[PDB]
């Protein structure tokens, strides 16, 4: 699938460090919230679950995918991509996360389609290296355009 189809515009960020574990989820989601792909409750569902148990979607050491079910407050279907130069430690995870990709979907089938698209990035260690070393939002965006 074209990866770019899920990325509106403001969806791609490089950050020195998130302020805390909650702000890392917020920076993974704010670009979707800003175009109302989601409601505010959608972010808080991920935060509350993370506090209660831990991050659901860890795909490799240092790599996460903040997301909640459509019914938690998604409104449309899209993604985000956020890199933290120093990372941040999520509770109950084994090490700090440096790379986060946001996802929202209006329906479970749209969620499956979106997941199958981003698996072409999150399940390819060659892409994970290039995302983790990305000097800029431009280098992050190139990897999206490559999909």
Swiss-Prot record:
Record PTM Phosphohistidine, positions in chain: 67
Signal sequence interval, chain numbering: none
A biological process from GO: phosphoenolpyruvate-dependent sugar phosphotransferase system
A GO cellular component annotation in the UniProt record: cytoplasm
Domain of life: Bacteria
Enzyme active site: 67 (tele-phosphohistidine intermediate)
PTS EIIA type-2 domain mapped to chain residues: 5-147
Cited Pfam families: PTS_EIIA_2
GO molecular-function term, one example from the UniProt record: kinase activity
InterPro entries: Ascorbate-PTS_EIIA_comp, PTrfase/Anion_transptr, PTS_EIIA_type-2_dom
Record localization: Cytoplasm
Swiss-Prot/TrEMBL keywords: Cytoplasm, Kinase, Phosphoprotein, Phosphotransferase system, Sugar transport, Transferase, Transport
Function: The phosphoenolpyruvate-dependent sugar phosphotransferase system (sugar PTS), a major carbohydrate active transport system, catalyzes the phosphorylation of incoming sugar substrates concomitantly with their translocation across the cell membrane. The enzyme II CmtAB PTS system is involved in D-mannitol transport.
NCBIfam families named among the record's database cross-references: PRK09854.1
Domain notes per entry: The PTS EIIA type-2 domain is phosphorylated by phospho-HPr on a histidyl residue. Then, it transfers the phosphoryl group to the PTS EIIB type-2 domain.
The protein's name: Mannitol-specific cryptic phosphotransferase enzyme IIA component
Record organism: Escherichia coli (strain K12)
GN (gene name): cmtB
């Amino acid at each position: 699938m074209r990866l770019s189809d899920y990325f509106p515009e403001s969806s791609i960020s490089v950050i020195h460090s998130a302020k805390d574990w909650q702000e890392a989820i917020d920076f993974s989601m704010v670009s979707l919230l800003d175009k109302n792909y989601i409601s505010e409750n959608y972010i808080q569902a991920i935060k509350d679950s993370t506090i209660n148990n831990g991050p659901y979607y860890i795909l490799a050491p240092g790599v996460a995918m903040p997301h909640a079910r459509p019914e938690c407050g998604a409104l449309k279907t899209g993604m985000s991509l956020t890199l933290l130069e120093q990372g941040v430690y999520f509770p109950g995870n084994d090490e700090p996360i440096k790379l986060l990709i946001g996802l929202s979907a209006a329906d479970a089938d749209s969620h499956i389609g979106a997941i199958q698209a981003l698996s072409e990035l999150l399940c390819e260690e060659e892409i994970l290296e290039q995302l983790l070393t990305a000097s800029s939002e431009k280098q992050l965006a190139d990897i999206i355009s490559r999909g």
